[PDB]
Scaffold this active site. Structure first.
Site, short mmCIF file in Angstrom:
data_model
loop_
_atom_site.label_atom_id
_atom_site.label_comp_id
_atom_site.label_asym_id
_atom_site.label_seq_id
_atom_site.Cartn_x
_atom_site.Cartn_y
_atom_site.Cartn_z
N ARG A 106 37.63 52.76 29.49
CA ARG A 106 36.75 54.23 29.86
C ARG A 106 37.56 55.05 29.63
O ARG A 106 36.65 56.24 28.95
CB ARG A 106 36.32 53.59 31.41
CG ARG A 106 35.21 52.97 31.24
CD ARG A 106 34.82 52.21 32.61
NE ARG A 106 34.50 51.12 32.95
CZ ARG A 106 35.03 50.39 33.45
NH1 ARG A 106 36.16 49.97 33.67
NH2 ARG A 106 34.20 49.30 33.91
N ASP A 166 30.01 48.61 40.74
CA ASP A 166 31.56 48.03 41.50
C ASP A 166 31.13 46.96 42.70
O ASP A 166 31.58 45.80 42.40
CB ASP A 166 32.81 48.49 41.80
CG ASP A 166 32.74 49.42 39.75
OD1 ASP A 166 33.92 49.39 39.59
OD2 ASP A 166 32.06 50.81 39.77
#
Ligand SMILES: NC(=O)c1ccc[n+]([C@@H]2O[C@H](COP(=O)([O-])OP(=O)(O)OC[C@H]3O[C@@H](n4cnc5c(N)ncnc54)[C@H](O)[C@@H]3O)[C@@H](O)[C@H]2O)c1
Length: 332
Positions: A106, A166
């Site tokens: 990312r 997450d």
């Protein structure tokens, strides 16, 4: 006369009307559309606005949602490249820009997406000066910092979707191992939505039973149960799904709708989302990463001070340092 004129007798004078809980989604890709469908499915908005640079795609998506209007509770759905359609949004979700190719970090997207945001953010604040912005585009923590700087809005109105996803993944894996519902397993992934995220082993519990108390080796390499692998599966999940289907979208679309629900219903529920964390746990730069935060109709109004273990502090510090390494070299 129109059959409209023949059928509908006005009781109130015509008036141009301003939406109560308008949401804009910027970017109608995999992630944008999944956020859109989750938002609509939960009846979270009276006016959905969509924006993209791909004009045909954009119109196509708008029409497809409109055709399902009968099954929804959102009376106005509009789409345009021009940000004028976004005026008077309560909440603007930014999912626009490039995404990870297989195996790509990312953090490697930062330069391309910073350029995208330099165009997008000023247009957003122009038409919705009082909005809340939820940043989804990656790297989400850095782009939240970028959005804050670019927009000139206060810290409580600029939020990264961060580790809500997450922690959802973490709670799912935990529940898999215990045979209960993820909502009954509790645990926080904090820091970077990325490779340096932190499993807060000290807060992991089922029914208030501290699992690290039952198993003091939880999260080490000396673990009978193998909790470190759970965190690793959390870290690796995006890469694994990207390898399989090319991108991820459903879990994040649901995560985003979860955050929006808390805000538009003014609930002050606590979520791990990306905020400006300078001064906490000895982090001394203007770093954005996820901590448990209180979300309501004003946005992100509070952060929860935690009693993190020393190792957890060190991990969170490493995450801040990784992120600051990139933030410091940004221009404008
Ligand atoms: N934060 C998270 O947990 C999370 C999860 C999944 C994906 N993401 C990120 O979400 C972003 C979107 O992923 P995706 O799969 O939807 O990508 P996608 O390629 O399917 O869609 C991206 C959309 O952005 C549009 N776009 C590009 N530049 C634009 C601009 N300047 N203005 C308006 N629109 C523009 C593109 O035309 C495209 O329609 C990526 O950065 C991805 O990494 C974040």
């Amino acid at each position: 006369a129109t059959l409209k004129e023949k059928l509908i007798a006005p009781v109130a004078e015509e008036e141009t009307t301003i939406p109560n809980n308008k949401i804009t989604v910027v970017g109608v890709g995999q992630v944008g559309m999944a956020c859109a469908i989750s938002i609509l499915g939960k009846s979270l908005t009276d006016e959905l606005a969509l924006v993209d640079v791909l004009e045909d795609k954009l119109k196509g998506e708008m029409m497809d949602l409109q055709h399902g209007s009968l099954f929804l509770q959102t009376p106005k759905i509009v789409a345009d490249k021009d940000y004028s359609v976004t005026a008077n949004s309560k909440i603007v979700v930014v999912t626009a820009g490039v995404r990870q190719q297989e195996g790509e970090s990312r953090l490697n997207l930062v330069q391309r997406n910073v350029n995208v945001f330099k165009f997008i953010i000023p247009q957003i604040v122009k038409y919705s000066p009082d909005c809340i912005i939820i940043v989804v585009s990656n790297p989400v923590d850095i782009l939240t910092y970028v959005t804050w700087k670019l927009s000139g809005l206060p810290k409580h109105r600029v939020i990264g979707s961060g580790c809500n996803l997450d922690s959802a993944r973490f709670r799912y894996l935990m529940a898999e191992k215990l045979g209960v519902h993820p909502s009954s397993c509790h645990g926080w992934i904090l820091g970077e939505h990325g490779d340096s995220s932190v499993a807060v082993w000290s807060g992991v519990n089922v029914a208030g039973v501290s699992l690290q108390e039952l198993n003091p080796e939880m999260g080490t390499d000396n673990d009978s149960e193998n909790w470190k692998e759970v965190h690793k599966m959390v870290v690796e999940s995006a890469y694994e799904v990207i390898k399989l289907k090319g991108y991820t979208n459903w879990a994040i679309g649901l995560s985003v709708a979860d955050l929006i629900e808390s805000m538009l219903k003014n609930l002050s529920r606590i979520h791990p989302v990306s905020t400006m964390v300078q001064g906490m746990y000895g982090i001394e730069n203007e770093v954005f990463l996820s901590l448990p935060c209180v979300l309501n109709a004003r946005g992100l109004t509070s952060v929860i001070n935690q009693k993190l273990k020393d190792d957890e502090v060190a991990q969170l510090k490493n995450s801040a340092d990784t992120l600051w390494g990139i933030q410091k070299d940004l221009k404008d």
